[PDB]
A paper describes a structure:
We expressed and purified the NBD2 Walker B mutant E1435Q Ycf1 in the Saccharomyces cerevisiae DSY5 strain and in the Materials and Methods section. The overall conformation has previously been unobserved with a 40.0 Å separation between NBDs, ∼5 Å wider separation than the previous widest model (G668 on NBD1 and S1411 on NBD2). This stabilized tetra-phosphorylated motif (PKC-PKA-CKII-CKII) makes a linear segment completely involved or bound to basic charges. The cryo-EM maps of the enriched tetra-phosphorylated Ycf1 also reveal a continuous R-domain density that encloses entirely around NBD1 in a path resembling previously published Ycf1 structures.
ATP-binding cassette (ABC) transporters catalyze the translocation of a wide range of substrates across membranes and support a variety of physiological processes including ion homeostasis, adaptative immune responses, lipid distribution, and detoxification. They consist of two cytosolic nucleotide-binding domains (NBDs) that can bind and hydrolyze ATP which promotes conformational changes in their transmembrane domains (TMDs). The ABCC family also expands the canonical ABC architecture with the addition of a long disordered link between NBD1 and TMD2 called the regulatory domain (R-domain) in some ABCC transporters. Some of the relevant transporters included in this family are CFTR, involved in chloride ion homeostasis; multidrug resistance protein 1 (MRP1) involved in the secretion of leukotrienes and drugs; the sulfonylurea receptor 1 (SUR1) a potassium channel that regulates insulin secretion; and the yeast cadmium factor 1, which is responsible for heavy metal and drug detoxification in yeast.
Author numbering: 1 to 332, 335 to 857, 882 to 891, 900 to 1515
Write the structure that this text describes.
């Protein structure tokens, strides 16, 4: 059948070169250029030209005129010029050349095509926004086609000495190349001009439009539209407003509606619906396009080793013929020698393959990640929309955390599947190509290498498993250390007061240095083994394959069988290793689809549960009618739980209808029926007008108080103030610091229940709804406040007198004013009627509940304070949400000077042993150098085989080659062991010890000002990053950096002229690296912060589904969810394309390196010095450089993100410590305090330098062993006297003398240790009872038991567990009562052998019985100690022998209790009169 075609092809082409694709000279033949490339591009231009022409003529003119400029006349001029040259070329055809059908058909088709192009340029300029894709590809293909025609003509002239179309044909084709190139540049480069008219509307847009929509096809391929964003993010920090809008197809509303339409189509039109089929039906097209580009990428990827094989064969045969003919120049026709130009065009073919592979690869990634974003947006919005209509049976079925995790986890899993979906076929497809390539290259010996890779797969999996086990144990010890630090920080006050810093620091170091770092050493060793395995296996595949080849095959192991084999094995390594990841992704995704499908199929609310209708007009009209013996069920499956039975409820406009009964008696169910939450099995139900609703639990959004009251309604100053006054919220609003601007709920200030209920009701009144459904709002409200609410809101004289009101409450006050009552017992309404009817019908129980109940500043404050038909509220325009990050902008005050803080890197290098860092870098060089010399020996081995034509001394060459591979592998083993054992672990031990010693030594002002959570975060997260992650990133960076440096010097050694290529590419590489570093880091930050509000909002919605469904604000809440999805995706879209912007440039740079190495090598072949080994070795290394450039840029980003952890750690390490703990010469005697003589010498102090004085000129002198009471008003600084005594805050003026030695000269340890304390903040450390009494183990157990006996704590300690002192205590002392903690603090205090005690009870009022026993123990046991008593209540002070009166930091009165009471005008007496003690006295 095909025999006719073979003969028919001979008739078309008459040139002796033939129709074949590649000529003898390595270029496209004349018949192939004219017959195929130019004809196909002409047919392409014709069929797609007229396609676009009819489309652009059918399409309506948009009205946006583009100004006719020098662009359009230049394009039309050059296209006319091109038509002229094609005409002249047609005339230049000779008589013999007319015989070729191909060339005449080429000029005919090109001439016809140019008229279509001439028209389409005009239509494109007039109407099309972007430069038309068809024109750009047409001029690209004809630039290529005419350039190939030029090179063909020039090669035939140079080698054969005849112009194949005359000099005229050469000159015309030269001008056609120049004309086509200039038309391509004028089409692609210049920006489209615009008329001045339409620019007035550019101020309406909020954000700039996406440049992707305006990007022509070359810009889309090269991703050059990202370049402007990269320059912006390099130059400054990216604010949210800088990010462009999403492209037109990415809106969450459009995607969700598309997937919703497909999904409900599956539900309706199939008996076995599947969510997966719906997804793959609606987003399946671009995945097919991605698969097509992946197939092209695989073919082009595996073309490169074959071109390398061709080139090495060419260089071998070129040198062979030079040596053969030069050695036989003695003789006198020789065949046509190999042309050197064939080498250059092979070198250029490698560039074209690398460039095309780069382009299709990133178009594959573009379509893949775009599909991932589409599936994420569509599923997220569908999940939210399904949440609003979940039946309460379904809502109670599943927990809130699981439903949020559907959005947060499962959708993220399906997004990740889209990345790896194409590898199910591309993996086998790449493997099948590679095995076929290797089989033809090496024969049967390939299978030994494949067996080794397959065998080493489970070994890799086993190492990953045990690595995961070690990582989990590392995380467990991290949590252990974090919890210990948390207890230390939370109880830092007691820790400093008792001088317990040393034992708890020793406890922390025992955990750290004994368990965590020991486990980290094990992790380091196993990572070293993993690195050794990853380094030896790529060698061992090639070494074993060549070993088996040489003995079994008689063929010579030449270079072409070796370096292409190494490249092919390297390409084989990746796809054979990703398959376990792909399969794991599929299983995880299959689980996620199961979760989502089960979620979407949950039972939804019955829409017809109630007929909701427009409002009723007249007062007294029936706004609610439930009747006909209506029956409603809580659940339809599995249990038919009848919620309500025989309901006949009816309510009228303006009247207050009350539902009364026990909890669960049906009252909350009947309100749920009005909302339509319950399923209606029988009866009819109606509700008229807008509904406002209040849940029994007051649900509050986490926004502002004003946002909670408005709740999407427009602002109105009069009603906003009026409702605040009506709800008695003004006093509560005034007490709040920022008033209505205060944040609310979980993130903001927590509100008390009665205050919370008032805010919830205030929302309802502001809506001005037609019907009010109130599920017991007065339960958490005080009586007098409730009366105020009954007067102004609910009463007939209130705001809502004209509105319908339903109030399910049982309080007597509400029932008295209520119009009609309904009695509801256990889901059955017994009887209803007006309140007057029941009053005379006293025999019924409704009167009885009133009977048995029976019978000023707060009431006055509550009571401190026509308009026919209050018009309803207006819902405000939804508009658009913009994320708020103003605090973050304040943090980034630098505005991206962005120069690297090299002081951090040097400080970290000094944290590691700097000598060990040099050793670590040394073994990287030794590793790579041996690996490079391993290939050099392989080059020498292959050359010897090629020269001999056999395999002489196979054992000798193979043994030496094996030795160098093991040498390189052992160097990586020693590299990673030195990394973890010596460098990384030493730095982690050094940094953590430096930080803990500094933080524990820091003064109290540091702990007070800084949040405790922030300090704990730096102890946990930053140390974890330094231990596990920071060492990893440096090792990956230096290994790849040294790898590229050895790759460069190998190529330069083979061809010294390559230096001139590296320098321009080096500056471009650094130029792209810096732009990616700043921009991609900032885009990831924006992406991260924008993720969380979507989940927090959805969790917030789930709490208040009843409220949202009550007010019918579903559309508003749905819109808010859609807007927050787009805000996150607006940051995610440029973040992803940042990678493809970078990866295109680096692969382009890598492709140019391959061109430079190949072409300069062939230039060296003309000199005659080149050998087959040199081009094989240098060019083989050049192919691998593209991956290493990607690693270096990526690891630099990882280094910068993690190195800030070292900066934060050093920030706390540099904290200025307080006064020294010990002064060597000034240490007091062991007996000190000998007596307890306290003397103050004009003492004065401030809490902080910036704060005013809190003590002034204190001259207090305390006799030994006197009971001193401290009395003072709030804010007098009475509590500051405690801190002054222990030097917790330094003395601004004066000094304190305890037993004729000033404590200022005494170290803080000697001061704080020798004094007994019962602090205000009673605190319990996590640990044993023994740990909380004597962590230093200074005292015997008998003394401890005596202390527990005196504290009345001995029996309770024995009761907790049989072990006694070893009994554990929970974190924070949760197991112990608050009063018990006071006794425990008392147990600590009495055990200290010192003669001075200070007792602080400035706020201790929890319980009196624990106070009484504490008091009696103080009087009895502590007789010999000088006691200072700081007490809130004066009753504890009246028995004191001496009393200090502190007022405004001065010594107001220092008198006995009798003198104070005798002086009725004293400050102490007046304070007692305020407390009422004077009345008793």
């Amino acid at each position: 059948m095909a025999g006719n075609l073979v003969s028919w092809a001979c008739k078309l082409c008459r040139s002796p070169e033939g129709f074949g694709p590649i000529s003898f000279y390595g270029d496209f033949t004349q018949c192939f250029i004219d017959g195929v490339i130019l004809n196909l591009s002409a047919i392409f231009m014709i069929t797609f030209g007229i396609r676009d022409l009819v489309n652009l003529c059918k399409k309506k003119h948009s009205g946006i005129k583009y100004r006719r400029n020098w662009i359009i006349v230049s394009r039309m001029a050059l296209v006319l010029l091109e038509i002229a040259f094609v005409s002249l070329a047609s005339l230049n055809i000779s008589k013999e050349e007319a015989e070729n059908f191909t060339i005449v058909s080429q000029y005919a088709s090109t001439m016809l095509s140019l008229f279509v192009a001439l028209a389409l340029h005009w239509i494109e300029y007039d109407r099309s926004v972007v430069a038309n894709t068809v024109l750009l590809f047409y001029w690209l293909f004809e630039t290529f086609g005419n350039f190939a025609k030029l090179i063909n003509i020039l090669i035939r002239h140079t080698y054969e000495g005849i112009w194949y179309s005359g000099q005229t044909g050469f000159i015309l084709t030269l001008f056609q190349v120049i004309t086509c190139a200039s038309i391509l540049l004028l089409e692609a480069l210049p920006k489209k001009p615009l008329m001045p008219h339409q620019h007035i509307h550019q101020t309406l847009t909020r954000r700039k439009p996406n440049p992707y929509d305006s990007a022509n096809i070359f810009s889309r391929i090269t991703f050059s539209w990202m370049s402007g964003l990269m320059k912006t993010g390099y130059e400054k920090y990216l604010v949210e407003a800088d990010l462009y809008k999403l492209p037109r197809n990415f809106s969450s509303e459009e995607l969700s509606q598309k997937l919703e339409k497909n999904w409900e189509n599956e539900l309706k039109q199939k008996s076995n619906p599947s969510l997966s089929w719906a997804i793959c039906r609606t987003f399946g097209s671009k995945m097919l396009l991605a698969a097509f580009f992946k197939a092209i990428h695989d073919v082009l990827a595996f073309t490169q080793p074959q071109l390398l094989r061709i080139l090495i064969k060419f260089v071998t045969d070129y040198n062979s013929e030079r040596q053969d003919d030069h050695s036989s120049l003695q003789g006198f026709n020789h065949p046509q020698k190999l042309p050197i130009v064939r080498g250059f065009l092979i070198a250029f073919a490698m560039f074209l393959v690398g460039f095309t592979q780069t382009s299709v690869l990133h178009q594959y990634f573009l379509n893949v990640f775009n599909t991932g974003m589409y599936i994420k947006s569509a599923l997220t919005a569908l999940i939210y929309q399904k949440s609003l209509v979940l039946s309460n049976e379904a809502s109670g079925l599943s927990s809130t955390g699981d439903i949020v995790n559907l959005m947060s986890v499962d959708v993220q899993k399906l997004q990740d599947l889209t990345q790896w979906l194409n590898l199910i076929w591309s993996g086998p497809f790449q493997i099948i190509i590679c095995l076929y390539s290797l089989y033809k290259l090496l024969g049967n010996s390939m299978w030994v290498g494949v067996i080794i890779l397959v065998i080493m797969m489970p070994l890799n999996s086993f190492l990953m498993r045990i690595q995961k086990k070690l990582q989990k144990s590392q995380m467990k010890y991290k949590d252990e250390r974090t919890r210990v630090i948390s207890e230390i920080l939370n109880n830092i006050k007691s820790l400093k007061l008792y001088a317990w810093e040393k034992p708890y620091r020793e406890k922390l170091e025992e955990v750290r240095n004994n368990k965590e770092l020991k486990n980290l050493t094990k992790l380091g060793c196993y990572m070293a083994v993993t690195s050794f395995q990853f380094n030896i296996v790529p060698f061992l595949v090639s070494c074993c394959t060549f070993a088996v080849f040489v003995y079994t095959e008689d063929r010579a192991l030449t270079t072409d069988l070796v370096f292409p084999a190494l490249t092919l094995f390297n390409l084989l390594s990746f796809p054979l290793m990703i398959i376990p990841m792909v399969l794991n992704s599929f299983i995880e995704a299959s689980v996620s689809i199961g979760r989502l499908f089960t979620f979407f199929t949950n039972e939804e609310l019955q829409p017809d549960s109630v007929q909701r209708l427009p409002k009723v007009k007249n007062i007294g009209d029936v706004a609610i009618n439930i009747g006909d013996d209506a029956t409603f069920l809580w659940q339809r499956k599995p249990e038919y739980k009848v919620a309500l039975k025989n309901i006949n409820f009816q309510a009228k406009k303006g009247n207050l209808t009350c539902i009364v009964g026990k909890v669960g008696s049906g009252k909350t169910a009947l309100l749920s029926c009005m909302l339509g939450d319950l399923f209606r099995v029988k009866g009819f139900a109606t509700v008229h007008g807008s509904v406002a609703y209040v849940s029994q639990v007051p649900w509050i959004m986490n926004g502002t108080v004003k946002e909670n009251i408005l709740f999407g309604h427009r602002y109105d100053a009069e009603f906003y103030e009026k409702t605040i006054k009506a709800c008695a919220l003004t006093i509560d609003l005034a007490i709040l610091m920022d008033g209505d601007k205060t944040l609310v709920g979980e993130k903001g200030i927590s509100l008390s229940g009665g205050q919370k209920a008032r805010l919830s009701l205030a929302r309802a009144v502001y809506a001005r709804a037609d019907t009010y459904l109130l599920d017991d709002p007065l339960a958490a409200v005080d009586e007098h406040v409730a009366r105020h609410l009954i007067e102004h809101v609910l009463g007939p004289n209130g705001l809502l007198h004209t509105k319908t009101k339903v109030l399910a409450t049982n309080k007597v006050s509400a029932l008295s004013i209520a119009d009609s009552i309904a009695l509801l017992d256990n889901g059955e309404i017994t009887q209803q009627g007006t309140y007057d009817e029941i009053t005379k019908d006293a025999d019924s129980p409704l009167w009885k509940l009133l009977n048995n109940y029976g019978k000023e500043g707060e009431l006055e404050q509550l009571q401190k304070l026509d308009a026919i038909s209050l018009r309803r509220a207006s819902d405000a325009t939804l508009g658009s949400i913009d994320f708020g990050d103003d605090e973050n902008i304040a943090k980034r005050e630098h505005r991206e000077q962005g120069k690297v803080k090299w002081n951090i890197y040097l400080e970290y290098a000094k944290a590691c042993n700097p000598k060990s860092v040099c050793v670590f870098i040394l073994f990287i060089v030794i590793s790579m150098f041996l690996s490079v010399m391993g290939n050099v020996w392989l080059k020498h081995w292959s050359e010897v085989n090629s020269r001999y034509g056999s395999n002489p001394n196979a054992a000798r060459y193979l043994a030496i080659y094996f030795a160098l591979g093991i040498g390189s592998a052992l160097a990586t083993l020693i590299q990673t062991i030195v990394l973890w054992v010596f460098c990384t672990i030493h730095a982690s031990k050094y940094l953590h010890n430096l930080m803990t010693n500094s933080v524990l030594r820091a003064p109290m002002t540091f702990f007070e000002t800084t949040p405790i959570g922030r300090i704990l975060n730096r102890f946990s997260n930053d140390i974890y990053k330094v231990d596990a992650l920071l060492g990893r990133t440096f090792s990956q960076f230096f290994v790849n950096a040294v790898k590229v440096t050895f790759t460069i010097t190998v190529i330069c050694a083979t061809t010294w002229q390559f230096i001139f290529i590296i320098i321009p590419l080096s500056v471009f590489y650094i130029y792209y690296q810096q732009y990616y570093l700043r921009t991609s880091r900032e885009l990831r930050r924006l992406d991260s912060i924008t993720r969380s509000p979507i989940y927090s909002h959805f969790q917030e919605t789930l709490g208040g589904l009843a409220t949202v469904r009550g007010y019918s604000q579903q559309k508003r809440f749905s819109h808010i969810n859609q807007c927050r999805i787009d805000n996150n995706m607006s940051a995610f879209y440029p973040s992803i394309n940042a990678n493809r912007w970078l990866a295109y440039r680096l692969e382009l740079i890598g492709s140019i390196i391959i061109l430079g190495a190949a072409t300069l090598s062939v230039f060296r072949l003309k000199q005659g010095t080149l050998t087959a080994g040199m081009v094989g070795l240098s060019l083989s290394y050049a192919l691998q450089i593209t991956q290493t450039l990607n690693w270096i840029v990526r690891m630099t980003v990882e280094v910068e993100t993690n190195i800030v952890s070292v900066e934060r750690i050093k920030e706390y390490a540099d904290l200025k410590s307080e006064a020294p703990l010990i002064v060597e010469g000034h240490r007091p005697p062991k007996e000190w305090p000998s007596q307890g003589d306290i003397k103050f010498n004009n003492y004065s102090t401030r809490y902080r330098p910036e704060l005013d004085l809190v003590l002034k000129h204190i001259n207090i002198h305390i006799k030994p062993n006197e009971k001193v009471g401290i009395v003072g008003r709030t804010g007098a600084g009475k509590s500051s006297l405690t801190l002054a005594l222990f030097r917790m805050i330094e003395a601004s003026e004066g000094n304190i003398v305890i037993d004729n030695i000033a404590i200022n000269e005494i170290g803080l340890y000697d001061l704080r240790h020798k004094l007994s304390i019962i602090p205000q903040d009673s605190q319990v450390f996590e640990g044993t009872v023994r740990e909380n009494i004597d962590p230093i183990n200074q005292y015997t157990d008998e003394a401890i038991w005596r202390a527990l006996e005196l504290s009345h704590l001995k029996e309770h300690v024995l009761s907790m567990s049989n072990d006694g002192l070893d009994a554990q205590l929970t974190e924070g002392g949760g197991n112990l009562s608050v009063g018990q903690r006071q006794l425990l603090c008392l147990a600590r205090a009495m055990l200290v052998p010192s003669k001075i005690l200070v007792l602080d009870q400035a706020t201790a009022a929890v319980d009196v019985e624990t106070d009484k026993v504490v008091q009696e123990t103080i009087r009895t046991a502590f007789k010999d100690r000088t006691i200072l008593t700081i007490a809130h209540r004066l009753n504890t002070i009246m028995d004191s022998d001496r009393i200090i009166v502190l007022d405004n930091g001065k010594v107001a009165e220092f008198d006995s209790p009798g003198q104070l009471l005798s002086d009725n005008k004293s400050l102490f007496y007046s304070l007692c009169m305020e407390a009422g003690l004077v009345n008793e006295n």
